[PDB]
Paper text:
α-Helical coiled coils are ubiquitous protein domains, found in a wide range of structural and functional contexts. The structure of coiled coils is understood at a level unrivaled by any other fold. They consist of at least two α-helices, wound into superhelical bundles and held together by a mostly hydrophobic core. The seven positions in a heptad are labeled a – g, where positions a and d are oriented towards the core of the bundle and are thus mostly hydrophobic. We find that they indeed break the α-helices to form short β-strands, which associate into a triangular supersecondary structure we name the β-layer. β-Layers are found, also repetitively, in natural coiled coils, where they form regular fibers with alternating α- and β-structure, a protein fold that has not been described so far.
To tackle these questions experimentally, we designed a set of constructs that had either 6 or 9 residues inserted between two consecutive [name] N16V adaptors, based on two different sequence motifs. One motif is [name] from Actinobacillus OMP100. From Actinobacillus OMP100 we derived the constructs A9 with the full [name] motif and A6 with the shortened motif IENKAD, as well as the ‘control’ construct A7 with the 7-residue motif IENKKAD. In A9 and in one of the T9 structures, T99, the β-layers are formed as in Actinobacillus OMP100. The first three and last three residues of the insert are in heptad register with the flanking [name] adaptors and therefore constitute positions a, b, c and e, f, g. The middle three residues, KAD in A9, KDD in T99, form the β-layer in place of position d.
Residue numbers in the entry:
A (entry chain B), B (entry chain C): 0 to 69
C (entry chain A): 0 to 67
The structure:
Amino acid sequence: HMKQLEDKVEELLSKVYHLENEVARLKKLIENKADKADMKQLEDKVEELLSKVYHLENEVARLKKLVGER
Amino acid sequence: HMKQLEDKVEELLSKVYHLENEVARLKKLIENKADKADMKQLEDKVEELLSKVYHLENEVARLKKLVGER
Amino acid sequence: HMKQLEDKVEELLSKVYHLENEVARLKKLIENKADKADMKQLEDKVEELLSKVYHLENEVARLKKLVG
């Protein structure tokens, strides 16, 4: 009876140890995931560069038209 | 006495089962997040592009000046 | 024998509580991380940028020749 009850507790304890170790592995995975704030900062840079290129494209198109008349 | 300890283990049985399911869910949530390595790959390319845009800016300003008005 | 069984249950009781808290903590941490769908969108924007840069370099080289 007490031997049977301690068998169940031991089975549960074994599961918990396994789960503890798995969660430690997952904690490490999470540390290696990219933060939203960092992605946003890179996105802002890309958008800054895309706007610079946009205005450059317009100017080059303008200049191309002007020189094509001369 | 033993009945009350069984009732405690019955409670813990359920908690361990729920924990197993929560950890499975956490593992799925983790898989939907991007790795830092993926972000750094993009960052490396943006670094290349930053220099190219700088050079383009200088070249286009030089050309705008040369061309002048109509 | 009865004290040993009670201590085994105490061990389980404590570890379950501790692991519940840790899993909840990690759940919260996850919410601050970037989704793969969003990184893929950024990857496509970076593609957009690199293509436009190459195209513009070529346009500028041609214009530069024409002006010079």
